[PDB]
């Protein structure tokens, strides 16, 4: 008889212890906002999350590494540049297979043919 434990608590009651409106069609708004994120120039990853990303991801290489404020902004920009090129390549490999929707398998082939897998 297979058994498993899920409560994960040796005792119960742990807390009590001393220790008419318009709707655009599915797809309509998207092209309006393709244009919004394309005519715009801001950086599309929130700085505090991305800053925290670079801090949490750089710590393992070298202890107590400080980043110049402009250094993470160069990273922010470089990453967005990297991903918009990869996503144009994605859209191209997706329109190849008689499709509009992308799927990861599109971008593993896009990375494989570019030579980094």
């Amino acid at each position: 008889a297979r058994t498993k434990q899920t409560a994960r608590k040796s005792t119960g009651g742990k807390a009590p212890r001393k220790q008419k409106p318009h709707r655009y069609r599915p797809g309509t708004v998207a092209l309006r906002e393709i244009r919004r994120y394309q005519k715009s120039t801001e950086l599309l990853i929130r700085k505090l999350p991305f800053q925290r990303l670079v801090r949490e991801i750089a710590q393992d290489f070298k202890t107590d590494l400080r980043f110049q404020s402009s250094a993470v902004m160069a990273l922010q920009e470089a990453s967005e540049a990297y991903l918009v090129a990869l996503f144009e390549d994605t859209n191209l490999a997706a329109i190849h297979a008689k499709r509009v929707t992308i799927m990861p398998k599109d971008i593993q082939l896009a990375r494989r043919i570019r030579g980094e897998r």
Binding site: A1, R2, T3, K4, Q5, T6, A7, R8
Partner: peptide
């Protein structure tokens, strides 16, 4: 097997 009891829908030690 699930993480909840099929009778009371609560967590605990189960017989699978």
């Amino acid at each position: 097997n699930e993480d909840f009891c099929s009778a009371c829908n609560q967590s605990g030690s189960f017989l699978c």
